[PDB]
Design an enzyme around this catalytic site. Sequence first.
Site, mmCIF file in Angstrom:
data_model
loop_
_atom_site.group_PDB
_atom_site.id
_atom_site.type_symbol
_atom_site.label_atom_id
_atom_site.label_comp_id
_atom_site.label_asym_id
_atom_site.label_seq_id
_atom_site.Cartn_x
_atom_site.Cartn_y
_atom_site.Cartn_z
ATOM 1 N N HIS A 84 0.421 7.903 1.037
ATOM 2 C CA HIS A 84 0.710 9.306 0.754
ATOM 3 C C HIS A 84 -0.253 9.919 -0.255
ATOM 4 O O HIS A 84 -0.106 11.102 -0.579
ATOM 5 C CB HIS A 84 2.188 9.478 0.341
ATOM 6 C CG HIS A 84 2.530 9.016 -1.045
ATOM 7 N ND1 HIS A 84 2.018 9.594 -2.189
ATOM 8 C CD2 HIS A 84 3.399 8.062 -1.465
ATOM 9 C CE1 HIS A 84 2.527 8.991 -3.254
ATOM 10 N NE2 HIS A 84 3.365 8.055 -2.841
ATOM 11 N N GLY B 281 2.842 9.745 -11.210
ATOM 12 C CA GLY B 281 1.624 9.000 -11.451
ATOM 13 C C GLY B 281 1.779 7.503 -11.317
ATOM 14 O O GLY B 281 0.769 6.795 -11.288
ATOM 15 N N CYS C 34 2.940 5.780 -8.757
ATOM 16 C CA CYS C 34 2.778 5.239 -7.420
ATOM 17 C C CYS C 34 1.586 4.304 -7.358
ATOM 18 O O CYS C 34 0.561 4.533 -8.006
ATOM 19 C CB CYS C 34 2.641 6.374 -6.415
ATOM 20 S SG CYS C 34 4.224 7.145 -6.270
#
EC number: 3.4.19.12
Lengths: 306, 306
Positions: A41, A143, A145
């Site tokens: 993503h 942030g 991820c």
Amino acid sequence: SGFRKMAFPSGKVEGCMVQVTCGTTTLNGLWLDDVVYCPRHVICTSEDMLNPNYEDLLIRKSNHNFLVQAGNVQLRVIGHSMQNCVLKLKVDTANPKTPKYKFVRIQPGQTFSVLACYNGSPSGVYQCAMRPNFTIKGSFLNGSCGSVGFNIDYDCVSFCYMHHMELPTGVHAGTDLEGNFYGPFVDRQTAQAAGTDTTITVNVLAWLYAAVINGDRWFLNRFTTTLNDFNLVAMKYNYEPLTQDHVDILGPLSAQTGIAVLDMCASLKELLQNGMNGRTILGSALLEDEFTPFDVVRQCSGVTFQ
Amino acid sequence: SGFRKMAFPSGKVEGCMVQVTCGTTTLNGLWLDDVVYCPRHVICTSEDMLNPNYEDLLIRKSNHNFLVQAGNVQLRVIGHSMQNCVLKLKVDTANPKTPKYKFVRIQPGQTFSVLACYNGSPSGVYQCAMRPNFTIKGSFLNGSCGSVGFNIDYDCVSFCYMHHMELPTGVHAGTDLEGNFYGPFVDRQTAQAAGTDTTITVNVLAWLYAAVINGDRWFLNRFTTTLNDFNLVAMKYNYEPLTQDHVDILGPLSAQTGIAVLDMCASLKELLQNGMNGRTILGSALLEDEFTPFDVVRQCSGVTFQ
Ligand SMILES: *[C@H](O)[C@H](C[C@@H]1CCNC1=O)NC(=O)[C@H](CC1CCCCC1)NC(=O)OCc1cccc(Cl)c1
Ligand SMILES: *[C@H](O)[C@H](C[C@@H]1CCNC1=O)NC(=O)[C@H](CC1CCCCC1)NC(=O)OCc1cccc(Cl)c1
């Protein structure tokens, strides 16, 4: 003695964390040999989230759209591919700090350490369990991820989790390192909810053995119970069924403590029915279920890593 | 969101751990530049423990009596000195992995990460607080002496604890890295007991703010209290007095949450007097006191380290 939620030493993983920037999104990647792994993503934009077709989104990208930074050395991407929900960025430099490693997909009830990261820099390390509903109760801000979860076996890092999103109850969902979500979740912005969770019974029993090893015994009793009649009580308190395989896994702890597995089950029954009555176990006023039997043995016997 | 007991990333410290063997004793040392730091009771023997004179014991040692192993590379000791209760072994090789570092002596109520070690190899990492009675509730087996506690500030490792012994209640005692014990303890085998502990009030309040930041609000109320009348209640429940300096330290969390410090004190009062009535806060059925106000801000704002 003593008993703590203990994470694995994080050094081997710290040397693999990088920053991946594409468009308006920044998140973390995992740099092993000449490949950077990160959530796919990262290629979405603020208007793509709704129902993205990542195949379309990815064919529109060029290598130079991916900004990979390893500290203050920027990494050129020379190719990219998609594997399930993870993006693999091929870079022209192999990570010299690549540990010996495996990718493993874990079962619910298994534990792992999370190295929480922002902008490729580690923030902290903590121990999680994969809940029966395939969420984890983590500590993740925007942030984070691409932060990974891992176990260490002697000298080898087994990566088992990469972070993707937070569900509306504040719990967390992500994938294995081959990009397959844990649970029914998708990297789509839609109605998604964790679903009903249950307590990890075999882990609670492991932790009761940890307590005995460490000198808490007030919850023991002379009773026993059968595996059937235990599971009848477990169901009523939203506990996972205890299997014969669980019983065999608890064998070593039973030997060392001299407390048959089914006797510890009878103790757990009474704790479920009567509560703790203002007592604590290993510093907790709740029954703790994020220690596996192996975690207990490792910590109560002093296993190390090289 | 979410809130975990989070340790600092341990990589910078893992690269400093070594094995120190002298006689029949093996423990861990901390290798920074060309010096290895370790507990001086490594020079004791099984009959020296009773009331040793370490000055005498040390003048009888030769450099070659100290076996220092950094992995599978053995380090020659070229000199030795004693500083309070730590031994400093001068070695002929500087550690190339030496981080930027400080030695700091912390105050009770401050927290730190412990990298638990055996035979110079890290076992696990976890967060501790220095209790008001200058013990820590650690997880330490035989061989763990010389494991260190530390904080990280941006890029700098502040070492604040080195492990020496376990007291009869199962809690742990040790020194700063200049060898001064925390508390009244001595590295002598005699009657030594922890003494009465108290709860770290300012930390409990920090953790209540963490809870609010994360969506637990059920414990809030409309009341307020004065600092005096709060401390009257604190004393009865064996809590540390709350100072005006504590109040000012809780300022940032109060701003961010819109909840005046003295209002959170009124909430803590009611939790003390009424209990939690089967509720939990941040997954705990007890009031948690091993998060400092800085820990809460760091975790709820996403600070990292380089
Ligand atoms: C990645 O860094 C981020 C991590 C989230 C943010 C807050 N807590 C976390 O764990 N992930 C997301 O922001 C994620 C992005 C979508 C993009 C489209 C495909 C599916 C993932 N969305 C998300 O987690 O939404 C819930 C959320 C709750 C609270 C704050 C935020 Cl910013 C998001
Ligand atoms: C050093 O590795 C060791 C760490 C102890 C062992 C168990 N838990 C710990 O934290 N320290 C000692 O064993 C210590 C040694 C003495 C030597 C003479 C000077 C003072 C320190 N003694 C000690 O901690 O005794 C209590 C104890 C309780 C349970 C088991 C053991 Cl082995 C010791």
